[PDB]
């Protein structure tokens, strides 16, 4: 994956920061956003974000996933 | 060189010599940090295992900046993390403060 | 769109030109100001600062209750400038 790709939540992902159901559990599975960033480094030195794929969805809402929780589309 | 029946703290310069000197007794390594809750929760229960299984060397590694190179050689991200060795080499691992796991993992080594 | 933010650092006083669609903290950083922070998503109380005068738009904030905002606080990592203003930085140590 990489920035610009479009993806769909193919694995159970329960966030709580969704404006739709703010402060309350909500499964993101099924939604199609777009990878906005992939966190592996920072100034050449390695980072260790356990959810390095940042996806930006519909309604200025974005969330973090692992590579397997998402599948590229096309 | 480590004291059996007790948890021995090692460093980058003493881990491999102690391991290479356990022979048949399986070795268990606690890779921790001084201020990490779960680790602290395991501490007590980790000692008693040492006191209870005299046929297994129990060790601990402070994963600070002094031991950064060994910590990297072994490999760790979650704290705590237990590496299990038997005959000069890592054979299994358990990450997290899981007593039930770490244990069944140990019992597998005592074959 | 750009207002002029005055920051009261415990080390001195600084005045930066923060745009209107830019956060006070991110604005502060473009001028070399080393203001504190942790999450930068208005969920903690680290970037926390205080308003002496002016109007912000920390609408993306979520950690400061209603009594803390009414008390005049703000989270600079999510705060937007709405007018010229003066914010005191490092104002967490006495927010609770």
């Amino acid at each position: 994956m990489n920035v610009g790709d479009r993806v769909r939540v193919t694995s159970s992902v329960v966030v709580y920061h969704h404006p739709e159901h703010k402060k309350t559990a909500f499964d993101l599975q099924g939604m199609e956003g777009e990878v906005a960033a992939v966190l592996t480094e920072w100034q050449g030195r390695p980072i260790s974000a356990n959810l390095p794929v940042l996806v930006k969805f519909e309604q200025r809402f974005k969330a973090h996933f692992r590579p397997d929780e998402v599948t590229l589309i096309e | 060189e480590a004291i059996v029946g007790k948890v021995t703290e090692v460093n980058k310069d003493t881990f491999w010599p102690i391991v290479k000197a356990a022979g048949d007794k399986p070795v268990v390594l606690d890779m921790f940090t001084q201020w990490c809750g779960p680790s602290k929760a395991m501490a007590p229960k980790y000692e008693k295992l040492a006191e209870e299984y005299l046929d297994v060397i129990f060790l601990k590694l402070d994963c600070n900046q002094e031991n950064k190179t060994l910590a990297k050689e072994l490999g760790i991200r979650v704290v705590p993390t237990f590496k299990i060795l038997k005959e000069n080499s890592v054979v299994g691992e358990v990450t997290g403060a899981k007593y039930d796991k770490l244990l069944e993992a140990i019992q597998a080594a005592r074959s | 769109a750009s207002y002029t933010v005055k920051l009261i650092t415990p080390d001195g006083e600084s005045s930066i030109e923060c745009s209107d669609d830019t956060y006070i903290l991110d604005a502060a950083e473009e001028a070399g100001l080393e203001l504190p922070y942790s999450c930068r998503a208005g969920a903690c109380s680290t970037c926390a600062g205080k308003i002496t005068a002016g109007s912000v738009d920390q609408s993306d904030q979520s950690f400061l209750d209603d009594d803390q905002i009414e008390a005049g606080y703000v989270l600079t990592c999510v705060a937007y400038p709405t007018s010229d203003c003066t914010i005191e930085t490092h104002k967490e140590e006495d927010l609770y």
Binding site: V13, V14, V15, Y16, H17, K23, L39, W42, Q43, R45, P46, I47, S48, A49, N50, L51, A63, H64 | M31, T33, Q34, W35, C36, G37, P38, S39, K40, A41, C63, A71, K72, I76, R77, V78, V79, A97 | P36, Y37, S38, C39, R40, A41, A43, C44, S45, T46, S62, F63, D65, E92, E93, L95, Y96
Partner: protein, 110 residues
């Protein structure tokens, strides 16, 4: 130390505001706050005291593991056991921790 305070007060208020609860063994909670705070005092950010990094200074600028970290923030997953969801075998019915507690857990810890 004043820094250790704020870290404690952040803890309490963040738990209440998200309905997360402190672990039944508040000692575990005191060490996550201690190390959480002992990081701000060194790196400038409460970088999670329960994981191992290759470059703390960097982890901190990225901010992924700055407490409250992305996971705890998006999925209520607090690996340090500072914030536990109700339906969690380690939880407690507390969202506050006596300041006297941390101090005594700072010494007993040796």
């Amino acid at each position: 130390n004043k820094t250790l305070a704020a870290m404690k007060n952040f803890a309490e208020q963040y738990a209440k505001r998200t309905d997360t609860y402190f672990c039944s063994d508040l000692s575990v909670t005191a060490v996550v706050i201690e190390g959480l705070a002992r990081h701000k005092e060194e790196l400038g950010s409460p970088l999670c005291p329960c994981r191992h990094y290759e470059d703390k200074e960097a982890e901190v600028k990225n901010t992924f593991w700055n407490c409250p970290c992305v996971p705890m923030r998006e999925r209520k997953e607090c690996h340090c056991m500072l914030f536990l969801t109700p339906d969690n075998d380690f939880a407690g019915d507390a969202q506050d921790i006596p300041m006297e507690t941390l101090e005594e857990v700072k010494a007993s810890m040796a």
